[PDB]
Design a protein around this ligand. Structure first.
Ligand SMILES: *[C@@H]1O[C@H](CO)[C@@H](O)[C@H](O)[C@H]1NC(C)=O
Ligand SMILES: *[C@@H]1O[C@H](CO)[C@@H](O)[C@H](O)[C@H]1NC(C)=O
Ligand SMILES: *[C@@H]1O[C@H](CO)[C@@H](O)[C@H](O)[C@H]1NC(C)=O
Ligand SMILES: *[C@@H]1O[C@H](CO)[C@@H](O)[C@H](O)[C@H]1NC(C)=O
Ligand SMILES: *[C@@H]1O[C@H](CO)[C@@H](O)[C@H](O)[C@H]1NC(C)=O
Ligand SMILES: [Cl-]
Ligand SMILES: [Cl-]
Ligand SMILES: [Cl-]
Lengths: 406, 38, 410, 405, 36, 37
């Protein structure tokens, strides 16, 4: 009667395996897999850029000045030109004239229309454009509004245009643009507001098409008077949700954005916050709500937004996405123009040699030979691996039983 | 005068903010009255 | 003999147990490590220490007759004759100032301490710092701790020492990072008439972003920031953990760095450099730790500079630094825009009471912040330790035991 | 009826054999500092192809159109942007009256008129050892005459470094000689709007493609390049896509993507133009200036930018990558300007335009490895699946006796 | 008559021979090249 | 007579004492230092 005593054994041994590794299933371990390669074909990213100057001086009208003057620090509360003005002679003669409101009747004013009309024009700024040896044009850039005003995005992959690809590493297969930033068109800076800049140049952001730009926070600089090489590597990160990980379980709860991204989450919060506090949304914000007026910008929106990003850590909680596309970047610089090319460029664009030196830049954004890296969280222990692992010690005791049945 | 409410310029009077508000200098712009920060 | 098909059923099953319980144990003794990777955004992230140096060691306006008398030769403003060399490249205006300064007739030398010289004549964070913000909190010269380096008097933001807590950031981007504006004061730069370790062809600053536990070696490991530009430095923090023997090469130390609390490669190097300089020169340089006379200008020139230069560049025998078990690295992406714009020039000129051109030469803005994914870990873990090897053995013999019971019946 | 169950557990093997038949790879990572580390090759080019002072009447005659200094008429175009003095010089140079053309070789032209490392290199140090122009090997690239430091060829051993930081790396000071830059009156592949140099840091086994893969360094700055070496190993089939080096390249010794590309470029140019460019390998007439202009330049431009069919480059099993961090400070300072001006016998302004310092070195952790390894090899499968595998033969051979009963 | 491979199509963009299109180049003048 | 450790060997490169070689420095004048294998 020890045939049952050995039956207690195969019952004992089994469950005392079967618990253990089946506890290990519930630790929910993840392993993170890495691979770094060159892709036969690689999807070129979206390239968004902004001029550091918000409004072209030549495009600012009397009505514009009247509404938006204080905001840009060209006027005081008195609708007058402050004595603090740093302006040279000729620009004041122009501005004083522009600023003369005697028998002037104000027309309606829209912040968006202002940005749109007076913002720098890709058609003026873009001297040359190539992608992969195909010539490209201003119509290859989609307009996108940012905190910087009117900005442009190359290969935005929206409005049903397909995303551009590249099969080869190096400058020749990437994007090369030449720009004139038009300092002569820069608004004079007589004071410090969120709408003013000490700097000349552009801001750029390289991002996946599924991720909107936050170009003031996450962008990078490109200076005039240089050719700037940006050598990239695309890195694709995948995360697991709970139980295995932290990443967003329910993705894109907004109708604002087709996909979930941290930037998307932030713009949502920024928008809501500005709507609650100011009753309006800024020009670059999504949604359905009145665009803030210049005064709203100044007395409510600018302050509320500044406060929200820098000071406030309570209001916006953004969970990490399950999918992130990062671009490694290497920047380098050579001078433009050379003494030898200066006159040729001056002649060609009908500008002074010095103007070229201040206003002209060339930007090359391309991929290095190994363009593609993946870092992916995978489940280390799953049930099926579990089935196979604990399958043996049961596959005995069941048949051990199957003999001894009565 | 009387107390300065949210988002308004506290320039030149740093104590005149209303309650719950402090006068905050900004990186790119003039100081303003904003919620106090723990 | 269908007994034999049961007889080889037990036979080679046992030989299986012996087979695996062998191979697994052989593995265990190989002390294998696996290296685990994770890249994420931290809910809150500890801001690093930011150390910077002006590329100019001594303010021209702060150099006295006594200073010139002792430190003149070192700075190549004087020869062994305590005279101003004819090789001088100076303009007429500084030349006269210097000749006056250099006139020792009926001059009696006072005492001189290299440290005090660096301290007094070094650039002053209070003059250099035009604006400072961290995360929208305004910050002040008192937020910078003085640290001496080969460059002379340098400053460290968020040094996390003297009981001040380390600053944190919960958000990615410029707005949540550090932004400083500096005037490097070229007009205050010492004239360069010759080449020594105390002279520079370059104008600008050197910066090093480092964990608070790691002292700076900013001349070796630093990076440049140029005047006339706004420089964006986008960072990612990467935390590396290593295993010691048997599994790996690393080491941990507390006080096992005599001069420092935590072990770091830089700490190990400064130790060696200090020892070496003390053995060879009998003194330590101004930026070195420990208890020992600070080298005089003369010692700098005839002993310390040469010995230190030699030690770092030429000598590979003397310092051997084992790798730390804990390393914090910062990934960096630099980019640049011009400052100032033609439109902002006069406004800045007026505001700081400087010529438009001066601004263009002397003014820079530095933004150091984190990108959205600020945090990466690369960690060596033990691949095979007791619990796993047991669980394999136990689950292995746990087969054989059971598969025996069958024979133990029929 | 375990004669059911032995057929059942045939599943367990059937799965875990199928996984081996997937030939899984794991990718192993380690990031460290090497006790000693092999310094890479550093190749650089001046952005200007030909020194103005070295261009002769014969040179101008053959290569003038190519450089856009001449039209098809062998005349100086009215579009010329030149100042007075250079125009004077060039008109003289361009006067072919009773001039008889001598023979002309593109390679010799690049070699003679290219910028000279001996003129360009003001100072050089590696690790505190002073270095000289004879430490630079000449390499021809699309940019013309270029130089490579630590090329590790001609039996010279590769340099090493045991320490992190500037002091243990490479520091060079250059004069790019803008005054020697050819005037730009038009746009060809041989002309540049930019002043400065291009640099490529590469393993000695990998030839440079410096126009595609390089980086810039600007005059008037000291540039710090902080590097980390990253060594990538891949598995071939069945496990992976790669191709092992030896014998896989026509004109080159080890396999690299760049090597594969230069092969294709060379073949293509030979097929289309009947000549090879100055920087290409192989044995074939060097293209003439006219061939450059009417055939080679166009065919090469087309091949790299437009054509994705012709060159198919498999990924190498071995890749050495260098992570780079660049930063800049200004040169010279107001205080050092005159001293440099005096020292090199140049105007203060010249220094500001033409002078740069380059520091290439490694950070403390100089070394990272990313290596594909085989996850399941002929122990794991046959140990477990194959081990209990014979047990079903054990079941069948046995259960045949259930039949012979 | 028609412009053959690699030759300049400058100022006449339609004059390329068959199988060829007139292609503008980043650094240089436009030329007749194979269609893609 | 012979130039000892760390001292300037400028203008006389052979005058270093024994075990010493005259070494040019990146940022400064040449000095007598220990020989390097
Ligand atoms: C990750 O997201 C990208 C687009 O952002 C998508 O194309 C891809 O399919 C996603 N991968 C996974 C595993 O979800
Ligand atoms: C490494 O060091 C840091 C402090 O220097 C410490 O907070 C951390 O726990 C250590 N990491 C590990 C896992 O060893
Ligand atoms: C402005 O600078 C000049 C010359 O540097 C000086 O004389 C004057 O004191 C300065 N003004 C103020 C307000 O300090
Ligand atoms: C890859 O290349 C290096 C140098 O050629 C060689 O030493 C190494 O063994 C190769 N990697 C492997 C593990 O095959
Ligand atoms: C210095 O430059 C001048 C240019 O006028 C030249 O004449 C002189 O030969 C140069 N000196 C040297 C060192 O050759
Ligand atoms: Cl935010
Ligand atoms: Cl050292
Ligand atoms: Cl190619």
């Amino acid at each position: 009667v020890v045939w049952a005593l050995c039956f207690m054994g195969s019952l004992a041994l089994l469950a005392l395996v079967c618990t253990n590794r089946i506890q290990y299933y519930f630790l929910y371990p993840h392993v993170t897999k890495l691979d770094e390669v060159a892709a036969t074909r690689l999807t070129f990213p979206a390239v968004t850029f902004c001029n550091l100057n918000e409004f072209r001086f030549s495009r600012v009208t009397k009505n514009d000045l009247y509404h938006a003057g204080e905001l840009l620090a060209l006027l005081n509360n008195r609708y007058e030109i402050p004595d603090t003005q740093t302006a040279d002679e000729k620009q004041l003669e122009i501005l004083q004239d522009k600023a003369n409101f005697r028998n002037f009747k104000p027309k309606p004013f829209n912040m968006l229309e202002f940005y749109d009309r007076a913002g720098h024009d890709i058609r003026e700024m873009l001297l040359s454009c190539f992608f992969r040896g195909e010539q490209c044009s201003p119509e290859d850039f989609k307009v996108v509004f940012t905190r910087y005003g009117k900005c442009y995005t190359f290969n935005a992959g929206q409005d049903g245009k397909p995303r551009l690809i590249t099969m080869k590493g190096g400058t020749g297969n990437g994007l090369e643009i030449m720009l004139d930033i038009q300092q002569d068109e820069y608004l004079p800076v007589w004071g410090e507001t969120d709408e003013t800049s000490f700097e000349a140049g552009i801001k750029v952001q390289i991002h996946s098409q599924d991720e909107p730009p936050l170009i003031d926070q996450l962008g990078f600089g490109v200076a005039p008077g240089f050719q700037t090489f940006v050598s990239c590597q695309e890195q694709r990160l995948i995360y697991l949700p709970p139980p295995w990980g932290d990443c967003k379980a329910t993705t894109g709860d907004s109708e604002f954005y087709d996909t979930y991204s941290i930037t998307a989450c932030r713009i949502d919060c920024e928008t809501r916050y500005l709507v609650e506090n100011c009753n309006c949304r800024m020009v670059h914000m999504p949604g359905d709500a009145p665009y803030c007026t210049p005064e709203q910008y100044k007395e409510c929106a600018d302050p509320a937004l500044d406060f929200l990003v820098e000071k406030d850590n309570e209001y916006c909680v953004c969970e990490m996405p399950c999918n992130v596309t990062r671009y490694g970047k290497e920047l380098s610089m050579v001078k433009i123009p050379s003494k030898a090319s200066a006159k040729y460029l001056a002649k060609k664009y009908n500008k002074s040699e010095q103007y070229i030196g201040e206003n002209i830049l060339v930007l090359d954004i391309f991929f290095e030979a190994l363009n593609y890296e993946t870092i992916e969280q995978k489940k280390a222990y799953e049930v099926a691996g579990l089935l196979g692992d604990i399958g043996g010690q049961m596959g005995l005791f069941i048949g051990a039983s199957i003999l001894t049945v009565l | 005068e009387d107390c300065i409410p949210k988002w308004k310029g506290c320039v030149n009077r740093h104590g005149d903010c209303c309650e719950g508000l402090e006068c905050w200098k900004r990186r790119r712009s003039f100081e303003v009255c904003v919620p106090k920060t723990p």
